[PDB]
Amino acid sequence: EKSQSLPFMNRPALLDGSMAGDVGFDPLGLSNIDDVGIDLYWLREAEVKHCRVAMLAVVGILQVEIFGPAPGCEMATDKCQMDAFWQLWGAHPQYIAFGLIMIMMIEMISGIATTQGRESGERAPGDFGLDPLGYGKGDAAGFARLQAQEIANGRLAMFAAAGEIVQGCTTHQGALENLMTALRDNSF
């Protein structure tokens, strides 16, 4: 009857309790929309993709700052987020637009699958069937934990990824550089 996360208000009607991470947090009623080609199925497919991109982006920033670039790249610089990106583009832009076309082929097909996956309810939101390791032929209670840990880490990574981009473009220093700077100023 009442939202677990907003206990002063009613729980939204379509937030059944079945998806991982569902604590009934939707105060504005966005799960209710069924117009302009988007709904709870499209919003969940959006969220899981935002999760995944942001989880990779945090490790990708921390990788080439702690350990530097991959072998075959040079002229390392202050921040690894923007300063290296325009630098590599100017250095050798072939591998970076190789990927942009390869992502483009993957996205056009995953977008067809999302529209085909809602018309016939046999594609789980987020599910591309990628389980080469077999986590999921195991315990259903243990696999339901893996579903919630993907969402919980992915939600936290969205703030961290959007964090490291914006304070990279603001301070023009590295992300671990910004953490040690903030440690110095609020030394307390």
Partner 1 sequence: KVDEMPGATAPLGKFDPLNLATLGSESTLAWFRAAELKHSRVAMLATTGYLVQAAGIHFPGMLSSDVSFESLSAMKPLDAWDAVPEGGKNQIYFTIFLAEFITECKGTHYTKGGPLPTIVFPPIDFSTVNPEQLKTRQNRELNNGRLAMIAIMSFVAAANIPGSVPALAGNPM
Ligand X SMILES: CCCCCCCCCCCCCCCCCC(=O)OC[C@H](CO[C@@H]1O[C@H](CO)[C@H](O)[C@H](O)[C@H]1O)OC(=O)CCCCCCCCCCCCCCCCC
Q: By the criterion CB under 6 A, which residues form the site for ligand DD6?
A: 85, 111-112, 115
53 is a contact residue toward ligand X (CB under 6 A): no
Please state the closest distance from residue 115 (CB atom) to ligand X, in A: 17
What is the Cα–Cα distance from 117 to 41, expressed in whole angstroms?
9
Report the interface residues with partner 1, using CB under 8 A: 183-184, 187-188
Stretch that binds ligand X, among 14-22, 28-36, 79-87, 112-120 (CB under 6 A): 28-36
142 is a contact residue toward ligand X (CB under 6 A): no
8 Å CB contact between 49 and 36: no
What is the Cα–Cα distance from 69 to 49, expressed in whole angstroms?
26
Number of residues in contact with ligand X under rule CB under 6 A: 7
Tokens standing for residue 19: 């998806």
* Helix or strand (DSSP H, E) at 51: helix 40-66
100 is a contact residue toward ligand X (CB under 6 A): no
Please state the closest distance from residue 184 (CB atom) to partner 1, in A: 6
Nearer to partner 1, 80 or 175 (CB): 175
Counted residue by residue, the chain has a size of 188
Please state the closest distance from residue 65 (CB atom) to ligand X, in A: 31
Q: Which does 184 bind (CB under 5 to 8 A by kind): partner 1, ligand DD6, ligand X, none?
A: partner 1
Nearer to partner 1, 115 or 149 (CB): 149
8 Å CB contact between 64 and 80: yes
- Residue of 8, 18, 28, 108 that binds ligand X (CB under 6 A): 28
What is the Cα–Cα distance from 37 to 19, expressed in whole angstroms?
21
Nearer to ligand DD6, 26 or 45 (CB): 45
8 Å CB contact between 173 and 78: yes
DSSP-derived 3-state class of residue 148:
helix
Tokens standing for residue 8: 């002063």
93 is a contact residue toward ligand X (CB under 6 A): no
DSSP-derived 3-state class of residue 186:
coil
- Given the rule CB under 6 A, which residues bind ligand X? 28-30, 32-33, 35-36
